[PDB]
C-alpha cells in the first residue's frame, strides 16, 4: 500500500548513506591525474 507518498523512513535514512558514498567517489575521481 502507499505510505503517504512521502514517508521519510527509509528515504530519510538512505539519502544520508548516498551522500557519504558520493563525496568519497569525487575525492578519488577529481583528485586523480586522469
From Swiss-Prot:
List the expressing tissues.
Answer: Wide tissue distribution; high presence in dense connective tissue in skeletal muscle.
What's the family?
A: Belongs to the fibril-associated collagens with interrupted helices (FACIT) family.
Provenance organism: Gallus gallus
Function statement: An adhesive role by integrating collagen bundles. It is probably associated with the surface of interstitial collagen fibrils via COL1. The COL2 domain may then serve as a rigid arm which sticks out from the fibril and protrudes the large N-terminal globular domain into the extracellular space, where it might interact with other matrix molecules or cell surface receptors.
Q: Where in the cell is it found?
A: Secreted, Extracellular space, Extracellular matrix
The UniProt subunit note reads as follows: Homotrimer.
The record describes its post-translational modification as: Lysines at the third position of the tripeptide repeating unit (G-X-Y) are hydroxylated in all cases and bind carbohydrates. Prolines at the third position of the tripeptide repeating unit (G-X-Y) are hydroxylated in some or all of the chains.
Q: What is the lineage of its organism?
A: Eukaryota, Metazoa, Chordata, Craniata, Vertebrata
The organism's superkingdom is given as Eukaryota
Q: What is this protein called?
A: Collagen alpha-1(XIV) chain
